[PDB]
Amino acid sequence: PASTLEGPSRPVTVPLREDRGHAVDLPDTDPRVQRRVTGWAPEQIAVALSAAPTSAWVSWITGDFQMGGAVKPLDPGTVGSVVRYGLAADSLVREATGDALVYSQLYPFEGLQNYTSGIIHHVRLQGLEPGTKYYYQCGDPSIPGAMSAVHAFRTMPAVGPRSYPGRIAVVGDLGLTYNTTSTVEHMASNQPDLVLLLGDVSYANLYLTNGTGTDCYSCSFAKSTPIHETYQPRWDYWGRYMEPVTSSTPMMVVEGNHEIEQQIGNKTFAAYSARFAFPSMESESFSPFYYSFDAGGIHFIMLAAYADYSKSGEQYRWLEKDLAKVDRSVTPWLVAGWHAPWYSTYKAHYREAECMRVAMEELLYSYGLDIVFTGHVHAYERSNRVFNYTLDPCGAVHISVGDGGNREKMATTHADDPGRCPEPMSTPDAFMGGFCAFNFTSGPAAGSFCWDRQPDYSAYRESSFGHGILEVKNETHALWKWHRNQDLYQGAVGDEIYIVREPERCL
Ligand SMILES: *[C@@H]1O[C@H](CO)[C@@H](O[C@@H]2O[C@H](CO)[C@@H](O)[C@H](O)[C@H]2NC(C)=O)[C@H](O)[C@H]1NC(C)=O
Ligand SMILES: *[C@@H]1O[C@H](CO)[C@@H](O)[C@H](O)[C@H]1NC(C)=O
Ligand SMILES: *[C@@H]1O[C@H](CO)[C@@H](O)[C@H](O)[C@H]1NC(C)=O
Ligand SMILES: *[C@@H]1O[C@H](CO)[C@@H](O)[C@H](O)[C@H]1NC(C)=O
Ligand SMILES: *[C@@H]1O[C@H](CO)[C@@H](O)[C@H](O)[C@H]1NC(C)=O
Ligand SMILES: *[C@@H]1O[C@H](CO)[C@@H](O)[C@H](O)[C@H]1NC(C)=O
Ligand SMILES: *[C@@H]1O[C@H](CO)[C@@H](O)[C@H](O)[C@H]1NC(C)=O
Ligand SMILES: [Fe+3]
């Protein structure tokens, strides 16, 4: 395996396999997505980190959702939010209480169906030892049968330059197909201590409110529907399917474009904002869309490609303050995640997030950002160290893992493929607006919008589904491994790199 200490590697493109169709969504008859509890018993149980290893969130839903007809939102105050926890399964002597809420998905158009959720609960457990296994039960102890089985998770290790989570899984754009189950099975077999999910979770917005789905909403329904519809039960199916993972392994989610889910009154992000726990208060972002947290000696920043990222905005000011608080002798690694890649070389979404790069890249570079993880593009790509489109030994490694297995088409065409360079005005993200993607003025592609071969800042690209694992070893070395779904033999690795940071050179 190469090391970033060797400098940039000559670009590699893996030849395409013959297309075998789109991934197939799990049906609503799959036992893993059906309601397996009754009454107010907890379902969709999920653990999330707090800003520091000494606290964590436990979340769950009680009660079935309502889809269609005259939905009647539940009163969240009718079911309590209690977690009992402890260091042994038979001694759950600690107790925490939390908050409950519901959300709805409402469309004021004739023929469209409305949805309202079960009661969602979020409870923060305080006073946890780092690096330690906690057993817990959640629910409402005053309702017979309304407590979960005993589950367990391990807190992140203590913050320090020699203290790291063993394995961090990174995925994006999962959806809920049979290929998603392959990604999640591969990931779970690698026993990660933490899962990062870089947006585009359930793909509920590939469905009409009446349950009909498509591989491409724009292709199918963009002209024949009054709004970009969703089928919200796909979120519940996803949460139920994922429970064996999320109830035992902390999972940190950040939003992608498929979470927009616009509804009545121009309300957006309702499901995303309600369903997951985020360390928004603890990291002082006060937003579900971006936040930070420490996991051992790693300071993680989750940024919002779909909230104002301009230099004059709230997110940028929060980011400046967050970075200024980082002590690189305590957390040597600075790692970021967000939905939209800045250096993807696929035709799909080429240069789409350029305005976010122009806004934020220099700030992150000035603080020595080590690694960036993104999703969005349905393929795998790893960059050489790069800053402002220039190979740079102090630039971040950008890795894109939006290849989680959702039913939309794989990204296969490259912008540098003959005749495939998109027209510049077609590239910017419409939801966020702006145009920042000008033709290059230096380097091999000077005067053009694209290269005519794989750009030298792209180390490796492959159109396969999969997931990655980050193994930070010490304050200067981390091992990254990406695994393709179609390889199932023990120890298979699709791409790997030793990432070596040089603080005396770059900070
Ligand atoms: C930091 O971690 C790296 C990777 O585990 C260590 O590098 C290894 O050190 C051993 C002993 O010298 C070698 O056999 C391996 O070949 C090294 N791997 C690589 C990629 O270089 C490194 O020693 C550690 N640095 C510390 C603990 O200060
Ligand atoms: C769905 O909710 C909206 C907003 O309350 C309402 O206008 C609409 O009539 C509802 N549709 C149905 C079928 O109840
Ligand atoms: C998705 O899963 C199906 C069925 O297991 C498989 O045939 C197909 O090759 C997978 N798609 C990719 C891109 O791996
Ligand atoms: C849902 O509505 C669309 C048209 O809006 C229709 O083509 C589709 O067949 C419907 N699906 C069901 C299950 O009714
Ligand atoms: C509608 O919602 C989105 C997301 O908040 C926002 O960007 C947009 O400006 C809003 N449009 C109007 C007319 O308010
Ligand atoms: C990035 O490169 C362009 C073109 O060379 C330059 O004008 C711009 O100032 C650079 N941005 C930063 C933050 O250096
Ligand atoms: C930018 O490059 C494209 C080809 O990639 C070319 O068609 C276009 O005319 C160029 N625009 C400018 C202002 O140079
Ligand atoms: Fe996306």
From TrEMBL:
Domain of life: Eukaryota
SUPFAM superfamilies: Metallo-dependent phosphatases, Purple acid phosphatase, N-terminal domain
Alphabetical UniProt keywords: Glycoprotein, Hydrolase, Signal
Residue ranges constituting the Purple acid phosphatase C-terminal domain according to the UniProt record: 449-496
Iron found in the keyword field: no
Catalysis: reaction(s): a phosphate monoester + H2O = an alcohol + phosphate
EC number: 3.1.3.2
Chain ranges of the Purple acid phosphatase N-terminal domain: 42-155
Stretches assigned to the Calcineurin-like phosphoesterase domain: 167-380
Keyword Signal included in the entry's annotation: yes
Protein name in UniProt: Purple acid phosphatase
Organism: Triticum aestivum (Wheat)
Gene expressing this chain: PAPhy
